[PDB]
């Protein structure tokens, strides 16, 4: 398992589709963006 951590002051936002458990995460694809 792995976890990515972002600060509150970080202007990047996790991509909403990944808040649904079970969504496929293709490595190198975008999971958060400014």
């Amino acid at each position: 398992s792995f976890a990515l951590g972002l600060r509150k002051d970080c202007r990047a936002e996790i991509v909403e589709k990944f808040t649904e458990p079970g969504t496929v995460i293709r490595i190198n694809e975008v999971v958060a963006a400014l």
């Binding site: 398992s1 792995f2 976890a3 600060r7 649904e20 190198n28 975008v30 999971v31 958060a32 400014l34």
Partner: protein, 346 residues
């Protein structure tokens, strides 16, 4: 029995409380293992051979799941003293899984009604499910004409690299766009949490992060108070290397000893499904045990100041709990480069 299992058994017997835990955890179990002695004997078989394709999880997990699902088992598995032995057991196993002899599962042979080798088309198909019609030997770097597809050990196969990431797993938007953060592991979405915090104990609010625990009281911990966390789960057949999520500098790598077989206490006693669409209690515990499992914490300073300091935690699960970094503190990396990988081990 191999010496590490001997010392493991001797430890169980050395402390009457531990010993009692290794009795109560088997209460009413009619199948093998039925006691801690059979457990040790089955370990002695498992650690001498490589895993095969077919089960819902790796082989130590499979024979441990019923034990993990008891109070007695959770108590035992949350003692740092015992976990030192699990570490040595799995490290010993991982030696074999790095050796030429572990290639014997890298075959197409069907082994029984439910299990087959890793080059069998059933398994080959499963491993490229998400690669959009491309085949195993296109996606991963191997030799489809060589024996064992060219891998020199099971671990080599387990940590197979991509033949051409720009086709199959591109750095979306390109390494030059520093406003994007990439997924570090081929995985499934597991949890996202916002406004994360620290807890004084991990009790009665199972499946909550505690920054202080997750990050092992690092001096950087306060910077991530109120921040957010995305967590993924890697299937047993997934690519198991780590890629850099940003262009940036490795600030700090910390290796934290922890648990292997601790599920969330709130799930102790839940049913262990005899299928595969239903998650067993352990696989409903990933947020909880990210706080306490053997893990590696990696702090990265993104080149883009608006992203800044980020962290990655690579979280072990049962026998797949070794976290090898292949980068060094101070090194620079681009989004998509190797950070390291998982191995069978402690």
């Amino acid at each position: 029995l191999m010496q590490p299992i001997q010392e493991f058994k001797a430890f169980i017997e050395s402390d009457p409380v531990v010993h009692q835990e290794f009795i109560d955890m088997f209460e009413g179990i009619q199948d093998s293992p039925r006691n801690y002695q059979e457990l040790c004997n089955m370990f002695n078989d498992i650690f001498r051979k490589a895993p095969v394709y077919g089960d819902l999880g790796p082989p130590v997990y499979m024979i441990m799941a019923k034990l993990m699902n008891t109070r007695a088992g959770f108590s035992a598995f949350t003692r740092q003293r015992l976990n030192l032995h699990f570490k040595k057991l799995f490290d010993t196993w991982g030696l074999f899984l790095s050796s030429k002899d572990s290639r014997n599962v890298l075959v197409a042979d069907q082994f029984d009604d439910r299990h087959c080798g890793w080059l069998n088309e059933r398994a080959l198909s499963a491993m490229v499910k998400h690669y959009n019609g491309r085949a195993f030997d296109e996606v991963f770097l191997c030799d489809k004409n060589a024996p064992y597809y060219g891998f020199n050990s099971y671990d080599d196969f387990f940590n197979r690299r991509f033949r051409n990431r720009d086709i199959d797993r591109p750095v979306v938007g390109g390494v030059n766009n520093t406003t994007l953060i990439s997924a570090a592991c081929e995985s499934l979405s597991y949890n996202v949490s916002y406004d994360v915090q620290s807890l004084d104990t991990l009790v009665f609010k199972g499946e909550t992060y505690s920054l202080k625990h997750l990050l092992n009281n690092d001096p950087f911990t306060p910077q991530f108070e109120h921040g957010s966390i995305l967590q993924g789960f890697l299937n047993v057949t997934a690519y198991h290397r780590w890629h850099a999520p940003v262009n940036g500098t490795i600030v700090k790598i910390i290796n934290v000893p922890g648990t292997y077989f601790a599920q969330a206490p709130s799930t102790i006693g839940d049913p262990i499904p005899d299928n595969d669409y239903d998650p067993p209690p352990y696989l409903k515990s990933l947020v909880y045990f990210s706080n306490i499992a053997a893990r590696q914490i990696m702090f990265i300073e993104a080149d883009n100041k608006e992203i800044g300091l980020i962290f990655l935690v690579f979280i072990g699960m049962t026998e797949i709990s070794t976290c090898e970094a292949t980068v060094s503190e101070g090194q620079h990396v681009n989004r998509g480069d190797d950070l390291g990988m998982f191995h069978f081990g402690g």
